[PDB]
CSV table of C-alpha atoms and ligand atoms in Angstrom, one decimal:
chain,number,residue,atom,x,y,z
A,1,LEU,CA,25.5,-76.5,128.7
A,2,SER,CA,26.3,-73.0,126.6
A,3,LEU,CA,30.0,-71.7,127.3
A,4,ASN,CA,31.1,-72.1,130.8
A,5,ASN,CA,31.5,-75.8,130.1
A,6,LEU,CA,33.9,-75.5,127.1
A,7,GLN,CA,37.8,-75.5,127.1
A,8,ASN,CA,38.3,-75.2,123.8
A,9,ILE,CA,36.3,-73.1,121.0
A,10,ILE,CA,37.1,-72.4,117.5
A,11,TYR,CA,35.1,-70.1,115.2
A,12,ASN,CA,34.4,-69.6,111.7
A,13,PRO,CA,37.0,-72.7,110.5
A,14,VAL,CA,36.9,-72.9,106.8
A,15,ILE,CA,35.6,-75.2,104.7
A,16,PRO,CA,36.8,-78.4,104.3
A,17,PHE,CA,38.3,-77.8,107.6
A,18,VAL,CA,40.5,-80.4,109.3
A,19,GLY,CA,41.7,-80.3,112.6
A,20,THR,CA,43.1,-81.6,115.3
A,21,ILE,CA,40.8,-82.4,118.3
A,22,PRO,CA,42.4,-80.8,121.7
A,23,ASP,CA,42.2,-83.7,124.2
A,24,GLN,CA,40.8,-87.4,124.2
A,25,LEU,CA,37.2,-88.3,123.4
A,26,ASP,CA,36.7,-89.5,126.6
A,27,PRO,CA,33.3,-90.5,127.7
A,28,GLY,CA,31.1,-87.4,128.2
A,29,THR,CA,33.0,-85.5,125.8
A,30,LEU,CA,31.1,-83.3,124.1
A,31,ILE,CA,31.3,-81.5,120.8
A,32,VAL,CA,28.8,-78.8,119.9
A,33,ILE,CA,28.5,-77.6,116.1
A,34,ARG,CA,26.9,-74.4,115.3
A,35,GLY,CA,26.1,-73.2,112.0
A,36,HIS,CA,23.9,-73.1,108.8
A,37,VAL,CA,23.0,-75.2,105.5
A,38,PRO,CA,23.3,-73.2,102.3
A,39,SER,CA,20.6,-72.7,100.0
A,40,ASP,CA,22.0,-75.0,97.6
A,41,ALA,CA,23.2,-77.3,99.8
A,42,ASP,CA,23.0,-81.3,98.6
A,43,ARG,CA,25.5,-82.9,101.5
A,44,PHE,CA,28.0,-82.2,104.3
A,45,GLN,CA,29.7,-84.1,106.6
A,46,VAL,CA,31.5,-84.6,109.8
A,47,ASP,CA,34.0,-87.1,109.9
A,48,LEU,CA,35.8,-87.9,113.1
A,49,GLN,CA,38.9,-89.3,112.5
A,50,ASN,CA,42.2,-91.0,113.5
A,51,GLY,CA,44.7,-88.3,112.0
A,52,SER,CA,44.5,-86.2,109.0
A,53,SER,CA,46.5,-88.1,106.3
A,54,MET,CA,44.8,-88.2,102.5
A,55,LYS,CA,47.1,-91.1,101.0
A,56,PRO,CA,46.2,-93.5,102.2
A,57,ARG,CA,43.0,-91.4,103.8
A,58,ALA,CA,42.9,-91.5,107.3
A,59,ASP,CA,40.6,-94.0,108.8
A,60,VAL,CA,37.5,-91.9,109.5
A,61,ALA,CA,35.8,-93.6,112.9
A,62,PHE,CA,32.3,-91.7,112.8
A,63,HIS,CA,31.2,-89.7,109.6
A,64,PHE,CA,27.9,-88.5,110.7
A,65,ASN,CA,26.7,-87.3,106.7
A,66,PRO,CA,23.5,-85.5,106.6
A,67,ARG,CA,21.9,-85.7,102.6
A,68,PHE,CA,19.5,-83.3,101.2
A,69,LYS,CA,16.7,-84.8,99.0
A,70,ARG,CA,13.1,-85.3,99.0
A,71,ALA,CA,13.4,-87.8,102.1
A,72,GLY,CA,16.2,-85.8,103.5
A,73,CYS,CA,18.5,-88.3,105.8
A,74,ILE,CA,21.5,-88.7,107.5
A,75,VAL,CA,24.1,-91.3,106.4
A,76,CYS,CA,26.3,-93.0,108.9
A,77,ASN,CA,29.4,-95.0,108.2
A,78,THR,CA,33.0,-95.8,109.6
A,79,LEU,CA,35.8,-96.5,107.2
A,80,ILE,CA,38.6,-98.6,107.6
A,81,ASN,CA,41.7,-99.2,105.6
A,82,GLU,CA,40.0,-96.9,102.8
A,83,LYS,CA,36.8,-99.3,103.0
A,84,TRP,CA,33.1,-98.4,104.2
A,85,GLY,CA,31.0,-100.2,106.5
A,86,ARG,CA,27.6,-101.2,107.3
A,87,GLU,CA,25.7,-97.6,106.1
A,88,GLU,CA,23.2,-96.6,108.8
A,89,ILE,CA,20.7,-94.3,107.6
A,90,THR,CA,18.4,-92.0,109.9
A,91,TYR,CA,15.4,-90.4,107.8
A,92,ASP,CA,13.4,-87.5,108.9
A,93,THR,CA,16.2,-85.6,108.8
A,94,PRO,CA,16.7,-82.3,111.3
A,95,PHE,CA,18.5,-80.7,108.8
A,96,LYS,CA,17.3,-78.4,106.5
A,97,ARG,CA,18.4,-75.7,103.4
A,98,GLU,CA,18.7,-72.1,104.7
A,99,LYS,CA,18.3,-73.1,108.4
A,100,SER,CA,20.8,-72.5,111.1
A,101,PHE,CA,21.4,-75.8,113.3
A,102,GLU,CA,23.5,-76.8,116.3
A,103,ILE,CA,24.5,-80.2,116.6
A,104,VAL,CA,25.7,-82.0,120.2
A,105,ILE,CA,27.9,-85.2,119.6
A,106,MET,CA,28.0,-86.8,123.2
A,107,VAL,CA,30.7,-89.0,123.4
A,108,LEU,CA,29.9,-92.6,125.4
A,109,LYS,CA,31.8,-95.6,126.4
A,110,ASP,CA,30.3,-97.8,123.6
A,111,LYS,CA,28.8,-95.1,121.4
A,112,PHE,CA,28.1,-91.4,119.7
A,113,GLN,CA,25.2,-89.8,121.1
A,114,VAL,CA,23.6,-87.4,118.7
A,115,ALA,CA,21.1,-84.4,119.1
A,116,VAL,CA,20.1,-81.6,116.4
A,117,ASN,CA,18.6,-78.4,117.9
A,118,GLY,CA,18.1,-80.4,120.9
A,119,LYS,CA,16.2,-83.6,119.8
A,120,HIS,CA,17.5,-86.8,119.8
A,121,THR,CA,18.5,-87.5,116.4
A,122,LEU,CA,20.3,-91.1,116.4
A,123,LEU,CA,22.9,-93.5,117.9
A,124,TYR,CA,26.3,-94.8,116.5
A,125,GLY,CA,27.9,-97.5,118.4
A,126,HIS,CA,31.8,-97.7,118.3
A,127,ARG,CA,33.7,-99.2,115.2
A,128,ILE,CA,36.9,-98.0,116.1
A,129,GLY,CA,38.2,-97.1,120.0
A,130,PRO,CA,37.7,-93.2,120.4
A,131,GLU,CA,40.8,-93.2,122.2
A,132,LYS,CA,42.4,-93.5,118.4
A,133,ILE,CA,40.4,-90.4,117.0
A,134,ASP,CA,42.7,-87.3,117.3
A,135,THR,CA,41.2,-84.9,114.1
A,136,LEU,CA,38.0,-83.5,113.1
A,137,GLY,CA,37.0,-83.1,109.9
A,138,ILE,CA,33.9,-81.1,108.2
A,139,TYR,CA,33.6,-81.2,104.6
A,140,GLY,CA,30.9,-80.4,101.7
A,141,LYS,CA,28.1,-77.6,101.9
A,142,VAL,CA,28.0,-76.3,104.9
A,143,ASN,CA,28.9,-73.1,106.7
A,144,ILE,CA,30.4,-73.5,110.4
A,145,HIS,CA,30.2,-70.9,112.9
A,146,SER,CA,31.6,-72.8,115.5
A,147,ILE,CA,32.7,-76.1,116.9
A,148,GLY,CA,33.2,-76.6,121.3
A,149,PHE,CA,34.5,-78.8,123.4
A,150,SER,CA,33.6,-80.1,126.6
A,151,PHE,CA,35.9,-82.6,127.7
A,152,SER,CA,35.4,-85.2,131.0
A,153,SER,CA,38.0,-82.7,132.4
A,154,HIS,CA,37.8,-79.9,134.6
A,155,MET,CA,35.6,-76.3,133.7
A,156,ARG,CA,37.8,-73.1,132.9
A,157,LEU,CA,38.4,-70.3,135.3
A,158,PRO,CA,36.8,-67.7,136.0
A,159,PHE,CA,33.2,-69.3,136.0
A,160,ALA,CA,30.6,-66.9,135.8
A,161,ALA,CA,26.9,-67.5,135.3
A,162,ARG,CA,23.5,-66.0,135.5
A,163,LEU,CA,21.3,-68.5,137.0
A,164,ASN,CA,18.4,-69.8,135.1
A,165,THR,CA,15.7,-69.4,137.9
A,166,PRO,CA,16.1,-66.3,140.2
A,167,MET,CA,17.4,-66.8,143.8
A,168,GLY,CA,14.7,-67.4,146.0
A,169,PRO,CA,13.8,-69.6,149.5
A,170,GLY,CA,14.1,-73.1,148.5
A,171,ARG,CA,16.5,-72.6,145.7
A,172,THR,CA,19.7,-74.6,145.4
A,173,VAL,CA,22.7,-74.0,143.8
A,174,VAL,CA,25.4,-77.2,144.2
A,175,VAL,CA,29.0,-76.9,143.1
A,176,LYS,CA,31.6,-80.0,142.8
A,177,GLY,CA,35.2,-79.8,142.5
A,178,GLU,CA,38.6,-80.7,143.3
A,179,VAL,CA,41.1,-78.2,145.4
A,180,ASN,CA,44.4,-77.8,143.7
A,181,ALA,CA,47.2,-80.1,145.8
A,182,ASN,CA,49.1,-76.6,146.6
A,183,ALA,CA,45.9,-74.3,146.9
A,184,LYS,CA,45.8,-71.5,149.0
A,185,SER,CA,42.4,-70.1,148.9
A,186,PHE,CA,38.7,-70.2,146.7
A,187,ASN,CA,35.6,-68.5,146.2
A,188,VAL,CA,32.2,-68.7,145.3
A,189,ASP,CA,30.0,-65.6,144.9
A,190,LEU,CA,26.3,-65.1,144.5
A,191,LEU,CA,26.3,-61.7,143.0
A,192,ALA,CA,23.3,-59.5,142.5
A,193,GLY,CA,23.5,-58.7,138.4
A,194,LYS,CA,23.3,-55.0,138.0
A,195,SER,CA,23.8,-53.9,141.7
A,196,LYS,CA,27.5,-55.4,140.7
A,197,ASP,CA,27.9,-56.2,144.6
A,198,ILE,CA,27.8,-59.6,146.8
A,199,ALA,CA,25.3,-61.5,148.6
A,200,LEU,CA,27.3,-64.1,149.6
A,201,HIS,CA,30.9,-64.3,149.4
A,202,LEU,CA,32.4,-67.9,150.1
A,203,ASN,CA,36.1,-68.2,150.6
A,204,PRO,CA,37.9,-70.8,151.7
A,205,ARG,CA,41.3,-70.5,152.9
A,206,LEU,CA,43.4,-73.8,153.0
A,207,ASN,CA,46.7,-71.6,153.8
A,208,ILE,CA,44.4,-70.5,157.4
A,209,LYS,CA,42.2,-73.2,157.2
A,210,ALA,CA,39.8,-71.3,157.4
A,211,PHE,CA,36.4,-70.2,155.8
A,212,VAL,CA,35.7,-66.6,155.1
A,213,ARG,CA,32.4,-65.3,153.9
A,214,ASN,CA,31.1,-61.7,153.8
A,215,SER,CA,29.1,-59.5,151.6
A,216,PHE,CA,29.9,-56.9,149.2
A,217,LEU,CA,27.3,-54.1,149.9
A,218,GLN,CA,27.6,-50.2,148.5
A,219,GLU,CA,31.0,-51.1,146.7
A,220,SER,CA,32.6,-52.4,150.3
A,221,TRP,CA,33.4,-55.3,152.5
A,222,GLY,CA,31.0,-55.7,155.1
A,223,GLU,CA,31.7,-57.9,158.6
A,224,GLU,CA,33.6,-61.1,158.1
A,225,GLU,CA,32.3,-64.2,160.1
A,226,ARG,CA,34.7,-67.0,160.0
A,227,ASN,CA,33.2,-69.1,162.9
A,228,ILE,CA,33.1,-72.5,162.4
A,229,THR,CA,32.8,-76.0,164.1
A,230,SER,CA,35.6,-77.2,161.3
A,231,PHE,CA,37.1,-76.4,158.0
A,232,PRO,CA,35.5,-78.6,155.5
A,233,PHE,CA,37.9,-78.0,152.8
A,234,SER,CA,41.7,-79.8,152.5
A,235,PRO,CA,44.0,-79.1,149.7
A,236,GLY,CA,43.5,-81.6,146.9
A,237,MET,CA,40.3,-82.9,148.3
A,238,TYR,CA,37.4,-83.5,146.2
A,239,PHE,CA,34.3,-82.0,147.5
A,240,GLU,CA,30.4,-80.8,146.7
A,241,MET,CA,29.2,-78.0,147.9
A,242,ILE,CA,25.3,-77.5,148.3
A,243,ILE,CA,23.8,-73.7,148.7
A,244,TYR,CA,20.4,-73.6,149.7
A,245,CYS,CA,18.3,-70.4,150.2
A,246,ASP,CA,16.3,-70.1,153.2
A,247,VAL,CA,14.1,-67.3,154.2
A,248,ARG,CA,16.3,-66.1,156.9
A,249,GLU,CA,19.7,-67.4,155.5
A,250,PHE,CA,22.0,-69.5,153.5
A,251,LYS,CA,22.6,-72.6,154.1
A,252,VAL,CA,25.8,-74.6,153.3
A,253,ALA,CA,27.0,-78.2,153.5
A,254,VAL,CA,30.1,-79.6,152.0
A,255,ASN,CA,30.3,-83.7,150.9
A,256,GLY,CA,26.7,-84.5,152.8
A,257,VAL,CA,27.7,-82.3,156.1
A,258,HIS,CA,26.4,-79.0,157.0
A,259,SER,CA,29.0,-76.5,157.4
A,260,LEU,CA,27.4,-73.1,158.3
A,261,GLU,CA,24.8,-70.8,158.0
A,262,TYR,CA,24.9,-67.2,156.7
A,263,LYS,CA,22.0,-64.7,157.8
A,264,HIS,CA,20.7,-62.7,154.8
A,265,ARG,CA,22.0,-59.4,154.4
A,266,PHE,CA,20.8,-58.5,150.9
A,267,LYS,CA,17.1,-58.9,151.5
A,268,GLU,CA,16.0,-58.9,147.9
A,269,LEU,CA,16.7,-62.5,147.4
A,270,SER,CA,15.1,-62.5,143.5
A,271,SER,CA,17.8,-59.4,142.7
A,272,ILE,CA,20.7,-62.2,143.4
A,273,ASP,CA,20.7,-63.3,139.6
A,274,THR,CA,24.8,-64.5,139.1
A,275,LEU,CA,26.8,-67.3,140.4
A,276,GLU,CA,30.6,-66.4,140.3
A,277,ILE,CA,33.7,-68.8,141.0
A,278,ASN,CA,37.5,-68.5,141.4
A,279,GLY,CA,40.5,-69.4,142.7
A,280,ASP,CA,42.6,-72.6,143.4
A,281,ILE,CA,40.4,-75.6,142.3
A,282,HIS,CA,39.1,-77.7,139.2
A,283,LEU,CA,35.8,-76.8,138.9
A,284,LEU,CA,33.7,-79.9,137.9
A,285,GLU,CA,30.6,-79.0,137.8
A,286,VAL,CA,28.1,-76.4,138.5
A,287,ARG,CA,23.8,-76.6,139.2
A,288,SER,CA,21.3,-74.5,140.0
A,289,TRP,CA,17.8,-76.0,140.9
B,1,LIG,O1,28.3,-95.1,103.7
B,1,LIG,C1,29.0,-93.8,103.6
B,1,LIG,C2,29.6,-93.7,102.3
B,1,LIG,O2,28.6,-93.9,101.3
B,1,LIG,C3,29.1,-93.4,99.8
B,1,LIG,O3,28.3,-93.1,99.0
B,1,LIG,C4,27.5,-94.9,99.0
B,1,LIG,C5,26.0,-95.0,98.6
B,1,LIG,O4,24.9,-94.2,99.8
B,1,LIG,C6,25.3,-96.2,98.0
B,1,LIG,O5,23.8,-95.8,97.8
B,1,LIG,C7,26.3,-96.8,97.0
B,1,LIG,O6,25.4,-97.9,96.7
B,1,LIG,O7,27.8,-97.0,97.3
B,1,LIG,C8,28.0,-95.2,97.8
B,1,LIG,C9,29.6,-95.8,98.1
B,1,LIG,O8,29.7,-97.0,99.1
B,1,LIG,C10,29.8,-92.0,100.2
B,1,LIG,O9,30.0,-91.6,99.0
B,1,LIG,C11,30.6,-91.8,101.3
B,1,LIG,O10,31.4,-90.6,100.7
B,1,LIG,C12,30.1,-91.9,102.4
B,1,LIG,O11,29.1,-91.4,102.9
B,2,LIG,O1,35.3,-60.4,153.8
B,2,LIG,C1,35.8,-61.0,152.8
B,2,LIG,C2,37.2,-60.5,152.0
B,2,LIG,O2,38.3,-60.4,152.4
B,2,LIG,C3,39.7,-59.6,152.0
B,2,LIG,O3,40.4,-60.2,152.2
B,2,LIG,C4,40.4,-59.6,153.7
B,2,LIG,C5,41.1,-60.3,155.0
B,2,LIG,O4,40.0,-61.2,155.2
B,2,LIG,C6,41.4,-59.7,156.2
B,2,LIG,O5,42.0,-60.4,157.0
B,2,LIG,C7,42.9,-58.7,155.8
B,2,LIG,O6,43.3,-57.9,156.9
B,2,LIG,O7,42.3,-57.6,155.1
B,2,LIG,C8,41.9,-58.0,153.4
B,2,LIG,C9,41.6,-57.1,152.6
B,2,LIG,O8,41.1,-57.8,151.3
B,2,LIG,C10,39.5,-60.6,150.3
B,2,LIG,O9,40.6,-60.0,150.0
B,2,LIG,C11,38.1,-60.3,150.0
B,2,LIG,O10,38.7,-60.9,148.6
B,2,LIG,C12,37.6,-61.1,150.3
B,2,LIG,O11,37.3,-62.8,150.5
C-alpha cells in the first residue's frame, strides 16, 4: 500500500537518473513512482533496463514514455540490440502538465501492469525476461519526488500502522509470515494511538514454547495469561494469524485453527487504532478488515 510495504525507497534523484534496482523484479513486485510534470514538459520516460551501458545503449525491457501534445498519450516499447519494437500507444493520458502523480508499476509473470493515480492505465506484455531487468532509468522533463519498491520478499521491521477503520466488534486483523529458523520470540500489538498503551499484546515465545499475551495499561504491564491447549508456533513455520474482535474478547486463530481468547481489559474498542509487529519473523502481509 503506502510505506510499511517498501524494502527500499529513494528520494529526489537527479534527472537523468540511472540506478540499480536493489532486488529482482519478481512477479508481484511493485514499483511506485511519485513526482510531478513541469509546466514546459514535452515528454519524459521510465525505462526498466538490462544494465546501464550507453554504448551500445543498454537494452530497455520496458520503455514507459508519457508524451504531452494535443492528444496526450503514453508510448510503450522495447529496445533490443539498439532497435525499437512494436510501438504501443495508450491515449487519454492520465498525466498532465503542472500536476503531480503516482505511478504504480506491478510486475506480473507475463506482463507489466501500470496504474496512475489509482486508475488502471495499460498492460505491457513481457518481451524480455524480467529476471534480466536490473536498472531503472528516468529521463526527460519530469520531477521525481520518490521511487519505492515492494518485492515479493518479506516486509521490513518494525511494522507500525494505524488501522484504516477503528477497532470494534466484527473487525478483523490477519497477519501472515514465517517464524525465523532460529526465532526466540515476536509480538503483535494493538495499541490505543494517543494513550500509547497496549490493548492486546500477542507475544509467542519459541524458546519457552509459550504464548504470552497481556495488556499494557497506565504505563504498566498487567497479569499475564499463557494458558493454552497447544503452542501454535514453531521456529521456521509459515503462519497466518487472525485476530478477530468480538464484544467480550479477542478471538485468535493460527493456520485455520482457534488458539485462544482474550477478554477485553481496554473497553474503549474504538480507541484501539494502531497495529505494531516486531520480533523474530519474516512479516509477509498485514490485513485489517
Ligand atoms: O517506439 C518507442 C520510441 O519511439 C521513438 O519515436 C518514434 C515515433 O513515435 C514515430 O512516430 C517515428 O516514426 O519513429 C520514431 C522512432 O521509432 C522515440 O524517439 C524513442 O525515444 C522511443 O520513444
Ligand atoms: O506481559 C507481557 C510482557 O512480558 C515481559 O516479560 C516479562 C516475563 O514475561 C516474565 O516472566 C518476567 O519475569 O518478567 C518480564 C518483564 O518484562 C516482556 O518484557 C514484555 O515485552 C511483555 O511481553
